[PDB]
Ligand binder design. Structure first.
Ligand code: HEM
Ligand code: HEM
Lengths: 138, 138
């Protein structure tokens, strides 16, 4: 997840916080209208102090903030790559070669699911590093 | 990222480690055949001690292990949800309602990019929690 991405997530979260109570009511009312069967899981007076919307939003945001902080190490790695002469345009071919090599080495135990997981993991990490390359790239 | 997912990633990583040197050579040879222009970024004798494949694989795996450990808190949250009477089948509607509410509250500042980021973040967290529900679900 890139810095640009977490920034726009945080900004939209702040927008909801600004209208927190209104947003929370809207969430409950929509939830119970689309799926009345979950209504009994909540207090009869749940609108008065329940915070379902924020419970979910805050968990997401707090988790993403932890992941973003951890990715500072990847940004440090990218800065080293700048110094190695590596450019943002080089990341796709390394990724393709990574998957090509894994497919070869794992053989008949390689699966579409594995290919997807490794592809998504590489692509996400590469996107963080590419974002850093762009900042130093003169 | 679910426990099932990180397990299959780790298993495939162990398979590569078993043939680490062979895999590393294959990676370099493929890389330089598809993109000879990156060859000068590497030592003339890079096959002898370079570890590009493992450098990338290990970074991915070590990052994913940290995220998996952090997700123990989400599994704890899911266990509480089991006790609240929540079922795996309830997660989609909460997610749809989350996005519906954000779209409403954010209005003309809501974007397809924001919708995608929030959708993916919710879906991923929900998948971790659903996996836990399945274990307790009698
Ligand atoms: C997600 C992608 C990548 C990851 C996780 C990664 C990881 C690493 C790591 C851990 C090192 C060891 C040195 C250090 O920590 O600074 C390294 C070195 C290096 N990487 Fe990467 N790298 C990635 C992408 C690339 C790309 C796209 C290239 C382009 C050719 C590249 C070329 C190099 C070079 C030239 C070195 C130093 C020379 C060497 O180790 O032989 N890397 N990389
Ligand atoms: C990713 C999805 C979800 C997240 C992050 C989440 C988060 C939370 C949190 C932080 C709490 C406060 C209590 C605690 O920590 O145990 C809570 C309570 C609760 N949640 Fe969730 N939840 C999610 C999905 C759901 C779903 C799908 C339902 C189904 C209706 C649900 C119903 C409830 C109920 C009934 C409570 C306790 C009663 C209340 O707080 O009013 N949650 N949830």
């Amino acid at each position: 997840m890139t810095r640009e991405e977490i920034k726009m997530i945080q900004k939209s979260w702040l927008r909801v916080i600004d209208k927190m109570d209104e947003a929370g009511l809207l969430f409950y009312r929509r939830l119970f209208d689309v799926e009345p069967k979950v209504r009994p899981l909540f207090k009869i007076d749940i609108e008065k102090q329940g915070r379902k919307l924020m419970d979910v939003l805050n968990w997401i945001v707090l988790n993403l903030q932890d992941i973003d902080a951890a990715l500072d190490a990847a940004r440090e790695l990218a800065r080293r790559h700048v110094k190695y002469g590596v450019k943002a345009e080089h990341y796709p071919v390394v990724g393709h070669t990574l998957i090509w090599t894994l497919r070869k080495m794992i053989g008949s135990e390689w699966t579409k699911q594995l290919e997807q997981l490794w592809t998504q993991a590489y692509e996400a990490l590469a996107q963080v590093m590419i974002e850093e390359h762009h900042h130093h790239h003169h």
